[PDB]
Design an enzyme around this catalytic site. Structure first.
Site, mmCIF file in Angstrom:
data_model
loop_
_atom_site.group_PDB
_atom_site.id
_atom_site.type_symbol
_atom_site.label_atom_id
_atom_site.label_comp_id
_atom_site.label_asym_id
_atom_site.label_seq_id
_atom_site.Cartn_x
_atom_site.Cartn_y
_atom_site.Cartn_z
ATOM 1 C CG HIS A 137 -2.050 0.959 1.089
ATOM 2 N ND1 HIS A 137 -3.307 0.686 1.580
ATOM 3 C CD2 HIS A 137 -2.096 2.200 0.543
ATOM 4 C CE1 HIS A 137 -4.090 1.739 1.329
ATOM 5 N NE2 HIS A 137 -3.351 2.695 0.721
ATOM 6 C CG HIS A 139 -0.551 6.607 -1.440
ATOM 7 N ND1 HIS A 139 -1.676 7.066 -2.105
ATOM 8 C CD2 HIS A 139 -0.971 5.728 -0.513
ATOM 9 C CE1 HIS A 139 -2.746 6.494 -1.574
ATOM 10 N NE2 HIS A 139 -2.347 5.651 -0.599
ATOM 11 C CE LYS A 220 -6.902 1.831 -2.961
ATOM 12 N NZ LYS A 220 -5.846 2.753 -2.571
ATOM 13 C CG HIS A 222 -9.141 5.428 -3.427
ATOM 14 N ND1 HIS A 222 -9.986 6.378 -2.939
ATOM 15 C CD2 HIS A 222 -8.104 5.332 -2.555
ATOM 16 C CE1 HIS A 222 -9.465 6.858 -1.813
ATOM 17 N NE2 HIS A 222 -8.315 6.221 -1.565
ATOM 18 C CG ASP A 224 -10.756 9.908 -2.689
ATOM 19 O OD1 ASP A 224 -11.643 9.549 -1.889
ATOM 20 O OD2 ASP A 224 -9.696 10.516 -2.354
ATOM 21 C CG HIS A 249 -10.220 3.507 0.062
ATOM 22 N ND1 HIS A 249 -9.358 4.294 0.827
ATOM 23 C CD2 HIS A 249 -11.459 4.089 0.172
ATOM 24 C CE1 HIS A 249 -10.012 5.300 1.355
ATOM 25 N NE2 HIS A 249 -11.316 5.193 0.999
ATOM 26 C CG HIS A 275 -7.366 1.352 4.321
ATOM 27 N ND1 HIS A 275 -8.670 1.228 3.901
ATOM 28 C CD2 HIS A 275 -6.714 2.157 3.422
ATOM 29 C CE1 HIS A 275 -8.811 1.940 2.765
ATOM 30 N NE2 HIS A 275 -7.598 2.507 2.429
ATOM 31 C CG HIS A 323 -11.418 13.996 4.136
ATOM 32 N ND1 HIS A 323 -12.334 13.221 3.442
ATOM 33 C CD2 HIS A 323 -10.281 13.256 4.216
ATOM 34 C CE1 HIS A 323 -11.785 12.050 3.138
ATOM 35 N NE2 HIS A 323 -10.519 12.048 3.592
ATOM 36 N NE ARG A 339 -11.654 7.351 6.727
ATOM 37 C CZ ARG A 339 -11.116 7.757 5.592
ATOM 38 N NH1 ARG A 339 -11.872 8.321 4.658
ATOM 39 N NH2 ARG A 339 -9.822 7.601 5.393
ATOM 40 C CG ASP A 363 -2.782 4.388 3.274
ATOM 41 O OD1 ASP A 363 -2.588 4.960 2.169
ATOM 42 O OD2 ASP A 363 -3.923 4.195 3.769
#
Ligand code: NI
Ligand code: NI
Ligand code: NI
Ligand code: NI
Ligand SMILES: [O-]
Ligand SMILES: [O-]
Lengths: 570, 122, 100, 570, 100, 100
Positions: A137, A139, A220, A222, A224, A249, A275, A323, A339, A363
């Site tokens: 995981h 990025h 992946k 996700h 988003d 995700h 996660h 966020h 969350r 992550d």
């Protein structure tokens, strides 16, 4: 002549029945077996055994059962065992685990572990040796993240990104053929193994599949990008054709579905649930129920690992700031409260201990720490021993069962999940020589030496101007394995079968070793080493209480951890 | 419960080295004027010419000391050492070029040792 | 200034030592890198002062005691090594078991 | 019109009969001759001589006797002389030493030293220019060691290692074909010239020879691999066939032989005796007697150079800690006392002064300092002048004889020993343009500019954000010669004739200049420039007293050195 | 903080100056890099204070005297140059023969 | 010392903070990087002291006030973030609008 056990361990490292403390934790590993012949131990130096006509054979050419490298007297900690052996490397691969030296004069020499003219020696006496960590995981946001990962014993990075673009800052995605080609080229300069994930989003197959043919190693999904039933379905159809893994995700917002809708879209196909506890993302509040299913390969990310007194305060604020959420907008506060849940984070510690969550991951730079996957694995095992006691399966007062369960979470299990365990993820004959040496006092905190493809890539070493290598300052430094063209031979770019068949490496001028992703689609939870438990996980929608076999899973957060302020300058 | 990070808790007992191999005690003299230190795994008949001992008793043998240690002879020093048997194929190549094959060829080893002036060929 | 690579790196040791000494001054028990930094900087500043290697091998054992450091730190530090320019050029100092 | 000599030297650098102090030492070099024509000196800048139609020729194309680079007004310090000249470089080689400029209008222009459109200019007025240092005892342990070496004027590293593996931490060895191939690839990224030594150990020829065919430039015999009569013999048989040099670190322990046994195994063949004084290794206590023999090319390593009040305390402790020796084990103390000897270290200073030890070297990171070979050479010459007086051979109150004897130890003599003096090791026409500019105040301490293959590789230069290059902080920095593909053209990989004939560079994809090792086997002590003395060296086995021509060689250790605390921040 | 490359490097000068000032405070005669560091940091801190280039060209000649430094150091330092952000942007300060 | 990459970088923050605190002590209004450095180092030293994340979220709002900094600096700093090793491992501290 006899040697007492204290002096024997001080000279050659520990032998059968001896125990070693892991860093400043309460965890003890015990040597289960030893491949040596007592009195014929290999060692190197002035008047030592590995000398011509003695423990070094002076007859055989390199091809004739001679090693390129012998790690002497290693304490191996691996899913396969906790045991004492010499490790023989040749052509960048582990070729022998056993006893090295010279069959001319020594008993018990493993036949392909001859020390000859061609053999380099690394002394592993008093070291713990593990497989390099496999972080699935990642990025790709800041190239400085690679040394961070090497310093904590990580040797493979699987994930996505193009640097500090918003898509990459949120998601492990290198989108489309052109960005994938550009990041395969970038990878030529990264001194670590790499595999790239494409965007697992689309309602037509072709836009997704062309990423796999361009050289992606996986996908992946996700939220988003829209973690919709369609994107899930098309990604898994591509993955089943291409033999690559899909990470998810899920839809935290439950916008197009609840967890049962995501599972219906998955339709029993194999998927890696990132996660899985859900602080890092997923169906609020019950995503962690994924970890009970036979077709789910479930991982944690590291900032919830383990549950501490600062965890919730840190996560709630991190989520609100990342966020752009306002403390005075009740929808924002309700979202954050749905969350970040102490009930699921506490249960995540216990699900790791029970072998229901199979994997750890970072992550890195999105909501996790590039250099703390190994660190937090052992902090979690230590907390569980303190709160839950030695597991039932333990013997001799050792923590060997827990140590094999936990080492599997960041070595072999991620490799199996990704389809790369034929190459990496464990200390076994026939696998790539990605090896990490640890001083036990620094175990899981700071790697001594990281070997990549049989050459040291990274080391804690001192003043380059000094008479000897140990004077201050001792710090993590890139070694010769990272320099010049040797970075190509010491590292693997993992790619889809189709991109390899279509000649992508030649088209892009990739000089790195090319690894094939395979055997990802007919595995399941049962294939996770020491972490194969399937069960009905119930998450109460009102209280967020987690139950397994009718029992609430809860534990307290701790105020202090080992592997923390004794070691770190900041 | 004081924590020493990375500490050992060794089991009880002792490790017997070179178990099941014949042991031999011999007297060895450094007839030279400079010190000689001999490692655990050198074929004992092939050590420094100026060490005086019964060279035949070094054939097929090495010091019965922990792997990686050495016996020291100061100038003029005579002392007893304990030898153990070589294992594996019981072949020696190189070192002083006295053997270059089976250690069973004692006649040939001693003829070479005598011609080159290794002391103690009887 | 004409800094060479070693001069640039060794500035880091001085800085870490200053950081550690501030932490000790506000009452903290020092950790492993803190303790190593203080003793290392002490050796380098002693060489600059014109002390002998023998004087620094002795003094380096009395810079920090058990009650200055966290549990286990004394047993984690087997020896501290530093090279510095003495009046007679670069020499290596090794301080054995600096914290008893 | 006449210019007084102070103003002349300030403008153009010193001329015939002028003297310059080397750093803060007592040593003075004197300009022996000057190639200029007074009034036609070359110089560059606003209203200066090297302008089109004036000292720059505007007619000739680059091929027509025009230079790529002119170093103006250099004070050369070289085995060939101490003299004033312009230095002309073309195609990365020194093509002219003489007078540069424009034959249109200037008298005395060396015909191939035309300044034209194609010519870059480096002002060397007031600088001392030497050949780059040739370090033949390098352990490849930590890549940060390269900048350390460049900062003290070293341009060639010969040795071995794979990084911080125990074999490499003890021995200058890259063992076997695979480790040699890997380190030739690594070398593609090292901004310095390199040659790699294989393991000089074996009882069969083939295991040794296959290292030479793989691309090794030489062999190292080391006691830690068994410095036995067999290993010595086979290594020298390989070397005589392959035309490469063999370095030896002999059997300190006298286990298989005393010094006379090692010399009998050598059997009159050429060999490079490393750290010949013996603190760095070799037959206790008499190894230094090697330096008397006609077939021995003898080098010192740098930590014994020169003999100081801290030397013995530092070495005894370093040896005990590096060998894990205990102060309470009498065999360990006896070994250390037999190896670290004030009697042989004191005599080593005098043997350098007498031209009986021919070479200096570092032993970088194994028992020596990567950036102090040049530094300690001059500290030694300075101590000898203070204790022994000007040598008999001196004239005009200058130290020119001593300066040529000492500069030879780290330039031409190592190059001759290694078989690479056709390419490097001196400022001569036809050799590679590896040149070091020194401000006299920093001579032998910190290089101003290091030129590699006619492009600056390394410089002491300031703030990259500033209006001009001199504002603080001024520090050693890699320059454009090290960047991109230019690192390939500015540096040489030295390799065996057989590896070159067998196409190893093409097989490995090496882009660096390839240098051939040759003419190493029919040289001897007589071929060492200014350092050619053979003599019977006697070392008393009881007192360790060194005698030459019936005279005890002894001197005092010094409490202070030049080139030390005036210059260094630590 | 948004540090650029120059800001990162120039932190090193401040650090070297702090090191040198501690050495001077315990009674040592300063060496070449020590002396350069102190005068350089003095110029940069003066710019930060809002002094003019002309004021720092004058002041920089009085920061260290002959008796603060080792033999030969005054004659080794012909001039010290530093760029810093003045109230009116980056300017170059050159201090000529700072130690007489 | 066994410094990892983060430990090496974060020494820079401490150094910048020491520089900024000297500037504040001689009466200067601090600029943007100065202010960020002081608050950042304060958070990291607080973690080392064993404070909680919640305590540092509160304290970080009272380290510097409007009258310590130049015009516009308060409005340039929306939040300062730092990670440090607490007694319970690495945690993220975000200080919101640290200078009112
Ligand atoms: Ni996520
Ligand atoms: Ni993520
Ligand atoms: Ni040696
Ligand atoms: Ni060496
Ligand atoms: O994530
Ligand atoms: O050596």
């Amino acid at each position: 002549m006899k040697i007492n056990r204290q002096q024997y361990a001080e000279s050659y490292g520990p032998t059968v029945g001896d125990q070693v403390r892991l860093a400043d934790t309460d965890l003890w590993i015990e040597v289960e077996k030893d491949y040596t012949t007592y009195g014929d131990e290999a060692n190197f130096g002035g008047g030592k055994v590995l000398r011509e006509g003695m423990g070094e054979n002076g007859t055989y050419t390199r091809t004739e059962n001679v090693l390129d490298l012998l790690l002497t007297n290693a304490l191996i900690l691996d899913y396969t065992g906790i045991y004492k052996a010499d490790i023989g490397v040749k052509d960048g691969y582990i070729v022998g685990i056993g006893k090295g030296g010279n069959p001319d004069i020594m008993d018990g020499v493993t036949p392909n572990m001859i020390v000859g003219t061609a053999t380099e020696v690394i002394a592993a006496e008093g070291k713990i040796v593990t497989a390099g960590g496999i972080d699935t995981h990642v990025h790709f946001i800041n190239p400085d993240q690679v040394d961070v990962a090497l310093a904590n014993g990580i040797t493979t990075l699987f994930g996505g990104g193009t640097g500090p673009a918003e898509g990459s800052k949120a998601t492990t995605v290198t989108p489309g053929p052109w960005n994938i080609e550009k990041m395969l080229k970038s990878t030529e300069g990264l001194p670590i193994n790499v595999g790239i994930l494409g965007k697992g989003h689309g309602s037509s197959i072709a836009p997704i599949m062309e990423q796999i043919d361009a050289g992606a190693a996986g996908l992946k999904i996700h939220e988003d990008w829209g973690a919709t039933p369609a994107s899930i379905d098309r990604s898994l159809t591509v993955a089943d054709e291409a033999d690559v893994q899909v990470a998810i995700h899920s839809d935290t917002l439950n916008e197009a579905g609840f967890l049962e809708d995501t599972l219906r879209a998955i339709n029993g196909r194999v998927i890696h649930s990132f996660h899985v506890e859900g602080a890092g993302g997923g169906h609020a509040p019950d995503i962690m129920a994924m970890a009970g299913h036979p077709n789910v390969l479930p991982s944690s990310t590291n900032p919830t690992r383990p549950f501490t007194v600062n965890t919730i305060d840190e996560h709630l604020d991190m989520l609100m700031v990342c966020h752009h959420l306002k403390q005075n907008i009740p929808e924002d506060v309700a979202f954050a409260d749905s969350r970040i849940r102490p009930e699921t984070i506490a249960a995540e510690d216990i699900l790791h201990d029970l072998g229901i969550i199979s994997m750890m991951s970072t992550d890195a730079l999105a909501m996790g720490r590039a250099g703390e996957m190994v660190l937090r694995t052992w902090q979690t095992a230590d907390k569980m021993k303190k709160q839950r006691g030695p597991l039932a399966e333990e013997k001799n007062g050792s923590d060997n069962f827990r140590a094999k369960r936990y080492v599997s979470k960041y070595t072999i299990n991620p490799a199996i999940a990704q389809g790369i365990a034929h190459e990496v993820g464990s200390i076994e004959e026939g696998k790539f020589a990605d090896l990490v040496l640890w001083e036990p006092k620094f175990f899981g905190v700071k790697a001594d030496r990281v070997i990549k493809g049989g050459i040291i890539a990274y080391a804690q070493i001192g003043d380059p101007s000094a008479s000897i290598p140990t004077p201050q300052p001792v710090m993590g430094r890139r070694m010769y394995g990272t320099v010049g063209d040797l970075i190509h031979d010491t590292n693997i770019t993992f790619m889809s079968k189709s991109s390899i068949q279509q000649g992508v490496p030649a088209k892009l001028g990739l000089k790195r070793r090319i690894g094939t992703v395979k055997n990802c689609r007919n595995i399941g939870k049962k294939d996770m080493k020491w972490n194969d438990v399937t069960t009905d996980i119930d998450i109460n929608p009102e209280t967020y209480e987690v139950k397994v076999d009718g029992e609430v899973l809860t534990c307290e957060p701790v105020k202090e951890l080992p592997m923390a302020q004794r070691y770190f300058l900041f | 419960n004081y924590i020493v990070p990375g500490e050992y808790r060794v089991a009880e007992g002792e490790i017997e080295i070179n178990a099941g191999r014949e042991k031999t005690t011999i007297r060895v003299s450094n007839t030279g004027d400079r010190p000689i230190q001999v490692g655990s795994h050198i074929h004992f008949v092939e050590v420094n010419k100026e060490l005086l001992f019964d060279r035949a008793e070094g054939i097929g043998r090495r010091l019965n000391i922990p792997s990686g240690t050495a016996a020291r002879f100061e100038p003029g020093e005579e002392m007893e050492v304990e030898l153990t048997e070589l294992g594996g194929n019981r072949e020696v190549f190189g070192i002083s070029d006295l053997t270059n094959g089976s250690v069973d060829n004692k006649e040939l080893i001693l003829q070479r040792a005598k011609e080159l002036g290794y002391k103690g060929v009887e | 200034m004409h800094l060479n690579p070693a001069e640039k790196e060794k500035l880091q040791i001085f800085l870490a030592s200053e950081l550690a000494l501030k932490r000790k001054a506000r009452g903290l028990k020092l950790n492993y890198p803190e303790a190593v930094a203080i003793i290392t900087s002490f050796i380098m500043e002693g060489a600059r002062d014109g002390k002998t290697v023998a004087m620094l091998m002795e003094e380096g054992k009395h810079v920090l005691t058990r009650d200055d450091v966290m549990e286990g730190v004394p047993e984690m530090i087997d020896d501290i090594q530093a090279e510095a320019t003495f009046p007679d050029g670069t020499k290596l100092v090794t301080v054995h078991n600096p914290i008893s």
